[PDB]
From a paper:
P4 ATPases are involved in phospholipid translocation: they flip lipids from the extracellular side of the plasma membrane or from the lumenal side of internal organelles to the cytosolic side. Most P4 ATPases function as a heterodimeric complex: a catalytic α-subunit containing 10 transmembrane α-helices (TMHs) and a regulatory β-subunit of the Cdc50 (cell division cycle 50) protein family containing two TMHs. Dnf1 and Dnf2 share the same β-subunit, Lem3, and both are also capable of transporting PE and GlcCer. Here, we report the cryo-EM structures of Dnf1–Lem3 in three different states (E1, E1P-ADP, and E2P) and Dnf2–Lem3 in five different states (E1, E1-ATP, E1P-ADP, E2P, and E2P-transition).
There were Dnf1–Lem3 in the E1 (apo), E1P-ADP (AlF4−-ADP), and E2P (BeF3−) states; and Dnf2–Lem3 in the E1 (apo), E1-ATP (AMPPCP), E1P-ADP (ADP-AlF4−), E2P-transition (AlF4−), and E2P (BeF3−) states. Next, we performed single-particle cryo-EM on purified samples in apo form (E1 state) and on samples incubated with AMPPCP (E1-ATP state), AlF4−-ADP (E1P-ADP and E2P-transition states), or BeF3− (E2P state). During the subsequent phosphate (Pi) transition, when the enzyme changes from the E2P state to the E2P-transition state, the enzyme structure largely holds still; the 3D maps of Dnf2–Lem3 in these two states are nearly identical.
Residue numbers in the entry:
A (entry chain A): 200 to 327, 424 to 628, 640 to 746, 751 to 902, 908 to 1480
B (entry chain B): 41 to 44, 50 to 414
Amino acid sequence: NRSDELRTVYYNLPLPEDMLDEDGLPLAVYPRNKIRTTKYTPLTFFPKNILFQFHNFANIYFLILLILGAFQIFGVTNPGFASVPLIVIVIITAIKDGIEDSRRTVLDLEVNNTRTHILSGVKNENVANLVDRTLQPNPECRFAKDYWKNVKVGDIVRVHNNDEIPADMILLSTSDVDGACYVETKNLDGETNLKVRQSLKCSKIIKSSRDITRTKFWVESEGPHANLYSYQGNFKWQDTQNGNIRNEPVNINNLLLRGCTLRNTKWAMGMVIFTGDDTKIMINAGVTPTKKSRISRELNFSVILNFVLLFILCFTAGIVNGVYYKQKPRSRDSTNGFVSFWVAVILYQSLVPISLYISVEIIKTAQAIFIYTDVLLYNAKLDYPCTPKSWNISDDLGQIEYIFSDKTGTLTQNVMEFKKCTINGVSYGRAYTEALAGLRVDVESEGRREKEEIAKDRETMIDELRSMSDNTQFCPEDLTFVSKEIVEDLKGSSGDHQQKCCEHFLLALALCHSVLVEPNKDDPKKLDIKAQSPDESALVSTARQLGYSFVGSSKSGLIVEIQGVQKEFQVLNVLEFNSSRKRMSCIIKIPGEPKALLICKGADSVIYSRLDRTQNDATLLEKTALHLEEYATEGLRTLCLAQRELTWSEYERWVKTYDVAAASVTNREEELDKVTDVIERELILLGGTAIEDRLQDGVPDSIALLAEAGIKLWVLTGDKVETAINIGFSCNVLNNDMELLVVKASGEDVEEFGSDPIQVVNNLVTKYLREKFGMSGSEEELKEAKREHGLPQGNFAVIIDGDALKVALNGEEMRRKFLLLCKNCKAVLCCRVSPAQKAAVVKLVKKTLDVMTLAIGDGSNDVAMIQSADVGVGIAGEEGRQAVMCSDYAIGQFRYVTRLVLVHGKWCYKRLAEMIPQFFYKNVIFTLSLFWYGIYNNFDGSYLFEYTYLTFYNLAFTSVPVILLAVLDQDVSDTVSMLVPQLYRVGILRKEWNQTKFLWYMLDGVYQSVICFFFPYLAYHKNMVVTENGLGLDHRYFVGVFVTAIAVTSCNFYVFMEQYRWDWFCGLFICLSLAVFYGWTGIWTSSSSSNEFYKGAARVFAQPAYWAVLFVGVLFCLLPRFTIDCIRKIFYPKDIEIVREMWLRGDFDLYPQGYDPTDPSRPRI
Amino acid sequence: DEVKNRRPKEDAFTQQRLAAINPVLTPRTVLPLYLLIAVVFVIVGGCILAQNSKVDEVTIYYQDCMTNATSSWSDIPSEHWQFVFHKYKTYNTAPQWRFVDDESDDFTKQRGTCQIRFTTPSDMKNNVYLNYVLEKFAANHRRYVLSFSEDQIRGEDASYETVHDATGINCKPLSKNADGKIYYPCGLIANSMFNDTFPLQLTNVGDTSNNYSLTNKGINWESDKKRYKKTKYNYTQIAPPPYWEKMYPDGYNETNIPDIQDWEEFQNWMRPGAFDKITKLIRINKNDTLPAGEYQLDIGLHWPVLEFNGKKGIYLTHGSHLGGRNPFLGIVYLIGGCICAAMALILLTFWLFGGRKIADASSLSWNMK
Ligand SMILES: *[C@@H]1O[C@H](CO)[C@@H](O[C@@H]2O[C@H](CO)[C@@H](O[C@H]3O[C@H](CO)[C@@H](O)[C@H](O)[C@@H]3O)[C@H](O)[C@H]2NC(C)=O)[C@H](O)[C@H]1NC(C)=O
Ligand SMILES: CC(C)CCC[C@@H](C)[C@H]1CC[C@H]2[C@@H]3CC=C4C[C@@H](O)CC[C@]4(C)[C@H]3CC[C@]12C
Ligand SMILES: CC(C)CCC[C@@H](C)[C@H]1CC[C@H]2[C@@H]3CC=C4C[C@@H](O)CC[C@]4(C)[C@H]3CC[C@]12C
Ligand SMILES: CC(=O)N[C@@H]1[C@@H](O)[C@H](O)[C@@H](CO)O[C@H]1O
Ligand SMILES: *[C@@H]1O[C@H](CO)[C@@H](O)[C@H](O)[C@H]1NC(C)=O
Ligand SMILES: *[C@@H]1O[C@H](CO)[C@@H](O)[C@H](O)[C@H]1NC(C)=O
Ligand SMILES: *[C@@H]1O[C@H](CO)[C@@H](O)[C@H](O)[C@H]1NC(C)=O
Ligand code: ALF
Ligand SMILES: [Mg+2]
């Protein structure tokens, strides 16, 4: 790409009016803004599709036999028109892929047809003291209508609130002074807090909308140099007072990415720098590969095995010609050997019928349309059902063993709230969890009782608060508080010390905040609240609900209304939360006797370190500490509050030292940190607040079902490690007795393992694999770890940082050691992971220990592993519309996956596993019959069946039942499969379909064909006249039609017997297929164009010998496999029939078909 | 100033909620099926055996008549006759046979007349079939089967292009003769027509007064004649097949065109055999019951058989509702019933004597570890 040669673009330096070239620079290579998320280019689609389809081995041999079928000089008749099936199958495949790509393109177009506006009306330079107050703005300035299709480097864009970002951006002017804007990078990472972005320091003084076009400068910016958080730009401009050029550098902090969104800013104009693939999301996206199924690889292996069968058969069949051909008898009238082999191989041309891939694609399309039409996956909240985008992948779901998820929108939504707090060791607020499951089977009744109790407590809390007084903005949509004792402890019934403590706790809950209060643009009466952080917004809403409303940000103080009475405080200073400080503090002044008050909110560790442990009562602190420890070990994430009181002189010398140290210049950060440390070394804790994040509906039960079904899942996280840890503890994933094998590279451990990260992680992995459990070794260990295919053991957890995972993934020895560790473990969490890092780790886990994985996720960052997992599923909706671009499937919410992958996967994994043997049985039964017939006439190469059979049989007679068994099979009910997902173990262990199963069916088909030939032949052999009337038979075509009818009825009965769901539908098609066989034979023989037969119906269906031979063939085709299956049922009883017997006995009788996770009130007994 | 359904179909088939019946492989509902199938099909096989041993047949092999016969009645070598008669299972009764030479014909390879005198201890229930059986004569080769043209069947005046340069179904090797006269019967099927003159009557031995006559007409389907029409050629461009010259030293003149419509036997030969053993209908009787006694048949031998080590013979049968007499169907029915019953009993004894609990909710895969 482009790294050097920074692009110099002018601004407010107009070109001469007489000549224009609509640019300031000469022409250069220009990547278009259009985002191509589809598979193939519409202009160049046919060669790509054919080459992808050409990679198989059956279609190529069909093509060569059609080609070489005419190159033979007068060996076989010219085809002429006997080539259209290949044409129709390839064009129908092309049409299906073109429809898929058309859907992708229309989705891209509707994404790119959004709305954008750029100002116009005055003379622009591209497309049509410091500040003075002499020029009056022109009223001609109006916003024009613009589209994302025509945005490119050299353009300015105005963006407002509730709008996305068109491309990589540079902040020029914002709605406020100093050019500070707030952005979510949710598509890039799952951080909760807003991201601050400062604009250019040169344009921090311009205020009015026309002042942004009053200064002339130019921009020197470089192209995408393949980096993630690095950028260097130069803004140069000439002063008017003196003649000189002054420049300002721009680092990554000023750069705004593409997959972001603007919050809390009325208007901001910026400069477009990158366009098209230059965005980071396109770098991390990929190439949207072909997404080719796994089963097709071994299907091609089976096809080439059948080719080897053909070659070995004809290599010994054609050799008999020569011992009789050159010998007696004869009364008819090298190269000859080669032409005999050629005629034999063209005779046996239907060992692999063309219908293979057309049937496969038909089955896949039917499965995709059924998945789409399934109403149990419809997300009525936003009108979007489960949409399978790529229909090629509908069979891989059965082998899903590993689950990879994200935190952006997968596990949880983007909402948090307040539930509990500790005030002087007293708990306030109550929630519902599953933390009492195992401390000492009936847990549903207690859960329902607790839910009812919580609902009643919330209702009565709301009622008491609306009754005791009329709050101005009291609404129940944000009241998450439960405990009612707050009111009577505020009333004064909780003594004096506790009363003061709880009053101050409630006051501090409404003061430490970086939120700005703004009136609602819809209704001034009910003003809205827009905070810099979601937890801060939740805290402010709770403070509003509890009667300590925070309104306004005055110059000296903040408005607080207690219960209705309004008063303005006197704030003195604020120290903002820092990513390294983990504490935010406020200093205010209260007029009595005035007094300064410090209140800081921070992490538990920092709060407990910043305390006064040298004198205390040894009771309050200890009880607060024990409450903190118990919440931590239950799995709550919380903060802590510390206050202090200062006299006038104390406030004065504090502000003096602040102004002399932190208010300075030249890296004031260290001075400010020292001042904060020396002022917070002594503090008095007042209690702690607890934030709680709401997950998706039905996350814990879904995780439990996937864990117990043998699918060990992983979670890959972003923003921070403690966030992931508390999310895991909140969910039913991380247990308290579970050992946390944290893997950090640059933590506080370094003081006793200082070295390079490679050696640090090597020592860590060696001490893990030598001390607790001894399995040190690489090659033998991988050999043993190949052969488990999923087992939950170990009961430990591992936490790894981004740097640690990258340094363990760079090297192959480190990679295999990490793979061994993660296989031993069960709770692999990855944090601070880049898209490239997670793509590399998913590639490694797919390649080593070859296992078919899934990458459910949301955002523009997860595509890197989505496109790697070979199955694509993403969370769609109003929250995410960027991962669904590349994901094969797009769900409404995670709650669907836990059923979809657990039901349909298995379904299809069995359906195809049964269809393949049926398809390779139905052709063997037809071809080996001809092979056996050849032994009489000595492999001369004579048709036994009608010329139309070889083209009409596999297309009409025995095709429908196999397709219907493949598509509308129901192994078990959906409800029973969800209730007992251990059946998925069969897909986990892949024993259902394999080479041994193939060999068994191939031997069965050989036996079937042997019988199907030898029966009518031996019936004839005595007399040639077994027809009840003599009158003329013996013709080859009549014995052929007899044996073909036997074969087709045997295949239909065998399909019916193997079908697990005998309904009025599959049986109806089987009956109609047999009927159409009979009817077509009759109507073809009762016609002028029946050259040979002219009498087939009367010659076949009027003869009791024909019925007798059909019945005995039915007997000998059904009894062998039936009795083998009956014996196997007792020998090695597969779990499927046991669960089916338990289901039919009545165990799962009261359970309705419409299973609901929210109904634990089933009357078992 | 600034400013800034899709419900899926709910049907029974759309949700795959059709009326289903899951099959169950429990012994208590499948053993009765085994028993009923076994008993019903073994008894129908016994009925087939009974209806099969109710017909008699005789085969006489005379492919080597000249080299073994004399001018007088001599006994038939044992390897040339096979009898089955339900009345008498030990009815050997070796018949007699003789050969007479004809000097009027110069085809020394195959000329003369073979006379066979044989006894019959039973009667034919108003249905007699005399057939000619062949062995070691491959009549199913790929080019041999296609060696004919369907266009000539309709009687239209086909050209050399329409019979040699046609599609895969045409008479390739024998389309045209040396001079250039197009064959009306073309190909190997019509060229390999047989030259055994069978009589239209039976020469009785006991009762020479009223000795019975047969009828070879109508031995094919009546409707099938609607496809075969009379020749419509110019009686000058048609020549007999090279192996048909013995019947026409001159060819086809104005008054000798063979009407395919009434020639049932030639049409019957147009149905080439499939296996090594080939036989077609040549004599049928449904007028009167054939009585017992001695009977003599005279056969003209002009078609060569021994030159390719092949064998030919005559086959006389009453017929049956199961066609020709064959015990193979009875054997397979009996063995299928017996093996089904044995399998049912043996699975029952393993299920009872050496059988575990019918169903356990704790014997599944996860229930050991
Ligand atoms: C061609 O026309 C021929 C005259 O109608 C006839 O071919 C054969 O011609 C001879 C000549 O007389 C007929 O007579 C032969 O047979 C009788 C016994 O029926 C002998 O007494 C004669 O001496 C002589 O050998 C034949 O009868 C006659 N063939 C037939 C079948 O009638 C045919 O009409 C035409 N050719 C063919 C092949 O049919
Ligand atoms: C005189 C003997 C040696 C040959 C004549 C007997 C004939 C009828 C028998 C004897 C041996 C038989 C062969 C034995 C082996 C095979 C190979 C098998 O894959 C196809 C059938 C075939 C080809 C048989 C055809 C029929 C056969 C040739
Ligand atoms: C030439 C020899 C060595 C090839 C091997 C043949 C023998 C050992 C193999 C081939 C087919 C096999 C049989 C296939 C089917 C069954 C039915 C099952 O219920 C019992 C085992 C049994 C009976 C197998 C026994 C072993 C077997 C007979
Ligand atoms: C069905 C029928 O009547 N067939 C007769 C046949 O019996 C008779 O020998 C012949 C005499 O030329 O005339 C036919 O029409
Ligand atoms: C013909 O068969 C007779 C009867 O068995 C026999 O005696 C004679 O030798 C045979 N002729 C041969 C073999 O040439
Ligand atoms: C019956 O036998 C006599 C014997 O003289 C024979 O002439 C006659 O042709 C026979 N009957 C028939 C119909 O041939
Ligand atoms: C007797 O046989 C002749 C043979 O042509 C046939 O025409 C006639 O109908 C038969 N008679 C009866 C009563 O079947
Ligand atoms: F959301 Al991430 F690494 F950014 F899991
Ligand atoms: Mg979460």
